Paper text:
Two new structures of DraNramp point-mutants reveal the coordination of Mn2+ in the inward-open state: M230A•Mn2+ and D296A•Mn2+ (Cα RMSD of 0.42 Å). The Mn2+ is in the same location of the orthosteric site as in the occluded state, as confirmed by anomalous diffraction for D296A•Mn2+. (A) Cartoon representation of the inward-open structure of D296A•Mn2+, which is nearly identical to the M230A•Mn2+ inward-open structure (Cα RMSD of 0.38 Å). (B) Coordination sphere of the orthosteric Mn2+ ion in the D296A structure is nearly the same as in M230A Mn2+-bound structure except for the sulfur of M230 replacing a water seen in M230A. We do not observe a bound water to complete the coordination sphere of D296A, likely because the resolution of the structure is lower (2.52 Å for M230A•Mn2+ vs. 3.12 Å for D296A•Mn2+), otherwise the structures are analogous. The peak from the anomalous difference Fourier map (magenta mesh; 4.5σ) calculated from a D296A•Mn2+ crystal confirms a bound Mn2+ in this inward-open state. The D296A and D369A variants each bind one Mn2+ with Kd=370±30 µM and 420±30 µM respectively, which is closest to Kd1 of WT. The occluded and inward-open states may be energetically similar as relatively small perturbations yielded inward-open structures (M230A•Mn2+ and D296A•Mn2+).
Author numbering: 43 to 239, 249 to 436
Write the structure that this text describes.
């Protein structure tokens, strides 16, 4: 009876999580372990409210905004929700193109051209054809996740710094830019618009969906913490050339995977980016339909999302660096998504007999308060550091 939360863990591991966990351990050691533990517990409460909203109300967060809020406010949220989709695909479409570079040696541009063909072709496939591929990409992402669960024990990390990595201690502005990037990688604001896509029958799924969320977020947190702790035991404190970048993250699993660490890491990173970008493009289409009632052709949405990725490549920026930036932008979109979440789930005309418990609503606002604080904390040091 164990399986649903495995699927959610492999779907949660996107290239955005790889870039933040590897860089978080290489440049800052274990000192960001508390960020991963805090973001997961935040995402447990956040993604639980997102699922409770869809079971009771029957609609999704975009649909409720379209039917209840004034038009100028619906357009603003649709534009805000449209930028969260572009920042999500920018982390996944670029991650697949980066894995192509680690496998074949193709440049970043041509690696995106191959990623562009796969993303276009994968959208035309039906639900019955992608079923084997969903298990194929699930296999590689799962084994690479258990690889870090075993290696974190075999790497023999300095437990004095591991346990001390759970006290919220700051390391300047660079720690905040990356701590914010970890929150955006875990919460995933676009899911807050996507997850939601008879109290005996409606509180039944709230009992069933709640089990899958807490169990899956548990392993995803263990995998993310293990990956950050292995990268800390590998590159941190040793002055490695270009440490933290995804071009050398395979060396974290060299003593475990032997000479197969580079291929098994890029393949698991390619399967993670190809699946999350095709599903992310499908998710962005339902979001626009919920806000505006109409939609653009899916090929046009797929092409517009590639333009910022090709522009970053044509400029010469570091692929691993722009993946972390996209996760920071997502964390600025979390407060904009939590507000329609904490308000709709706390209305009796919207939920019915499933009004959110008064304790979870207050905690959810404090989570938004902390993220607003952490976003406001960061946003100062950039221009006056
Ligand atoms: C990801 C949340 C876990 C959901 C199901 C995990 C339990 C069964 C899975 C593997 C068995 C290996 C046991 C060692
Ligand atoms: C280490 C990662 C931080 C998260 C772990 C908690 C450590 C104590 C912090 C807040 C107390 C939580 C109060 C309980 C009510 C919420
Ligand atoms: C600082 C920048 C905040 C920007 C926009 C406000 C976002 C939150 C505003 C949402 C208020 C919810 C609302 O509009 O209330 C609906 C009312 O009942 C009408 O039907
Ligand atoms: C910047 C946020 C974008 C705000 C976009 C506002 C769009 C708007 O005002 O709605 C259209 C109006 O109803 C028709 O004139
Ligand atoms: C559900 C969470 C997944 C749990 C997998 C974590 C441990 C994996 C293999 C056992 C370690 C290998 C030791 C046994 C052979 C020696
Ligand atoms: C901060 C990180 C927090 C999360 C981290 C905990 C997660 C570990 C859970 C399961 C993996 C256990 C599997 C590891 C078992 C390997 C032991 C073994 O096989 O021993 C081989 C060694 O070579 C003989 O000396
Ligand atoms: C999770 C933290 C890693 C736990 C495994 C570390 C370990 O095995 O500690 C043995 C060490 O050699 C004894 O000093
Ligand atoms: C769900 C996982 C997080 C739950 C909350 C975590 C509590 C923080 C304490 C220990 C971390 C667990 C790993 C144990 C290794 C660290 C133990 C330790 O504190 O080491 C003391 C001394 O420094 C040795 O050298
Ligand atoms: C480059 C943008 C234009 C190239 C893509 C055009 C492909 C096309 O014609 O698609 C037709 C569509 O199915 C019907 O709206
Ligand atoms: C990534 C694709 C979405 C990015 C946003 C472009 C959406 C199309 C532009 C205006 C829609 C027209 C609305 C009716 C006026
Ligand atoms: C901004 C420069 C980017 C250059 C590549 C554009 C990507 C478009 C790919 C195919 C278009 C027809 C299908
Ligand atoms: C920068 C903060 C991002 C979002 C701020 C939201 C604050 C809106 C509070 C209540 C809305 C009115 C209640 C209905
Ligand atoms: C350096 C300091 C930086 C920190 C910066 C922020 C400081 C915190 C300010 C306000 C927190 C307010 C706590 C949130 C309480 C909201 C509870 C609530 O509104 O829930 C009611 C619900 O509607 C019932 O049905
Ligand atoms: C988009 C997320 C909001 C970002 C900006 C929020 C408004 C500024 C709040 C600062 C709290 C005080 C911080 C003190 C440290
Ligand atoms: C806003 C309060 C946060 C300012 C106080 C936090 C100390 C860290 C800091 O702001 O300094 C880093 C950067 O160089 C800029 O000063
Ligand atoms: Cl450290
Ligand atoms: Cl309302
Ligand atoms: Mn993520």
């Amino acid at each position: 009876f164990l399986g649903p939360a495995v699927i959610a863990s492999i779907a949660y591991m996107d290239p955005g999580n790889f870039a933040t966990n590897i860089e978080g351990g290489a440049r800052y050691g274990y000192s960001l372990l508390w960020v991963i533990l805090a973001a997961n517990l935040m995402a447990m409460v956040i993604q639980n409210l997102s699922a409770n909203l869809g079971i009771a109300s029957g609609r999704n967060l975009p649909e409720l905004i379209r039917e209840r809020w004034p038009r100028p406010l619906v357009w603003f949220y649709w534009i805000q929700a449209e930028l969260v989709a572009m920042a999500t695909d920018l982390a996944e479409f670029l991650g697949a193109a980066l894995a192509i570079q680690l496998l074949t040696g193709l440049p970043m541009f041509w690696g995106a051209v191959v990623t562009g063909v796969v993303t276009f072709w994968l959208l035309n496939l039906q639900k019955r054809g992608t079923r084997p591929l969903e298990l194929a990409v699930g296999a590689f992402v799962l084994m690479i996740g258990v690889a870090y669960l075993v290696q974190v024990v075999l790497a023999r990390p300095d437990l004095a710094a591991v346990g001390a990595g759970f006290v919220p201690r700051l390391q300047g502005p660079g720690s905040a830019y990356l701590a914010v990037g970890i929150i955006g990688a875990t919460v995933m604001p676009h899911v807050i618009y996507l997850h939601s896509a008879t109290t005996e029958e409606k509180r039944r799924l709230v009992r069933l969906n709640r089990v899958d969320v807490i169990a899956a977020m548990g392993l995803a947190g263990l995998i993310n913490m293990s990956m950050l702790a292995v990268a800390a035991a590998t590159f941190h404190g040793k002055n490695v050339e270009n440490a933290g970048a995804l071009t050398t993250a395979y060396q974290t699993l060299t003593p475990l995977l032997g000479p197969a660490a580079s291929v098994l890491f890029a393949v698991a990173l390619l399967a993670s980016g190809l699946s999350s970008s095709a599903v992310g493009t499908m998710a962005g289409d339902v979001i626009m339909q919920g806000f505006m009632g109409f939609h653009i052709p899916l090929w046009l949405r797929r092409l517009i999302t590639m333009l910022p990725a090709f522009i970053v490549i044509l400029l010469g920026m570091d692929p691993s660096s722009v993946l972390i930036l996209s996760q920071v932008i997502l964390c600025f979109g979390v407060p904009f998504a939590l507000v329609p979440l904490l308000l709709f789930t706390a209305r009796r005309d919207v939920m019915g007999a499933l009004v959110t418990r008064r304790s979870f609503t207050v905690i959810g606002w404090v989570i938004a308060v902390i993220i607003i604080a952490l976003n406001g904390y960061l946003l100062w040091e950039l221009l006056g550091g």
